[PDB]
Structures are given as C-alpha cells and as structure tokens.
Amino acid sequence: STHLADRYNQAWLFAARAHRNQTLSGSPLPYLVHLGMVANELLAADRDGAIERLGETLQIAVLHDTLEDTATSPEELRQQFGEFVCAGVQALSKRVPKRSLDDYLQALAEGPAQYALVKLCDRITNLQPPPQTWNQDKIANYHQESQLILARLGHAHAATARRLREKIEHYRQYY
Ligand SMILES: [Mn+2]
C-alpha cells in the first residue's frame, strides 16, 4: 500500500524490533519513545510546508538510528524500504569510523533536503529538558552543537527551522 500510515507501520515495526530492549538516554523507557517523537515532528512539519516523498521521509525519521545502534544492515534497509530510505538513514548515521560533525552536517546540507529535515526534527526532539545527569558544561555543549545544526541545515524547511531556533533559544534556560 502507498498509504502514509502503512509506510509508517512497516518502518515502525522494523524499528521496534531493531531497537528491542534499547532505552532512552537518561531514562529506563524504551528508545522507541524517541522515534515516535521524531516521526511525529516530521509529519507535523509537512503541515507547515509540504514535503516531497513524505512517506519515505517519515520512514527515514522512524529508522534514523537503526544503522548506528542496531544490528540492521544497509542491505536490509535497501531491500525492505528502498534506496532513498537506505541512503537517508546512512546520511543521518555518524557511524554505522565516526564522522566529524562538520563533515556530517555538510553532507546532509548538500544532499536531499528530506534527510536534513529529519535531522532538524531529531534535534528539536532532543531539545526536551536534558537528562538529570548532565552537568552545566554538557548541556551548554549540546546547545552549541544544536546551533551548528540549525546553521548548516535550517535551509531544508523554513517552518521547522523556525521551530528549531525557538527550541534552541528556550534550551538556554537549562544551564
Ligand atoms: Mn535520534
């Protein structure tokens, strides 16, 4: 089926199995908590500026951490979701040799805008209140990194860029 919800379910079930028994950062809740919010950000973003290839991009949102933290291979993503989804997850993976942030963001900035948009949604989601065990320095550093993500990637989707900027501004209160 081409239906947006069927595409999400396929990716969502795959991600739930891949991230089985993985948790959040600074919480015992399932890592799935994170993916639900990123995917929902993406779908919400479409309402403020339509996205080309929305269904695949929503799958990328759901799947964006599979290569970096699960036993998922690129070949599985390609066979089950297509090359565009696979390339999106790869673009969003720093490590599947960890790429430096500058190279990582530059490749997202120069590639398909949908992939950069997923990163904006990822970072918006990660600018919830920091985990209880981060000190001021670590929270401050996360703010700095977020600023670079907005600078390099905000071009991808204006409404989401504005939302990321507001989340970045609001984040300064946590330190
Ligand atoms: Mn993420």
UniProtKB/TrEMBL annotation:
The lineage of its organism: Bacteria, Pseudomonadati, Pseudomonadota, Gammaproteobacteria, Pseudomonadales. Coiled coil: none annotated. SUPFAM superfamilies: HD-domain/PDEase-like. It comes from the Bacteria. InterPro entries: MESH1. GO terms for molecular function: guanosine-3',5'-bis(diphosphate) 3'-diphosphatase activity. This is Bifunctional (P)ppGpp synthetase/guanosine-3',5'-bis(Diphosphate) 3'-pyrophosphohydrolase. Pfam families: HD_4 (PF13328). Keywords: Hydrolase. It comes from Pseudomonas aeruginosa.
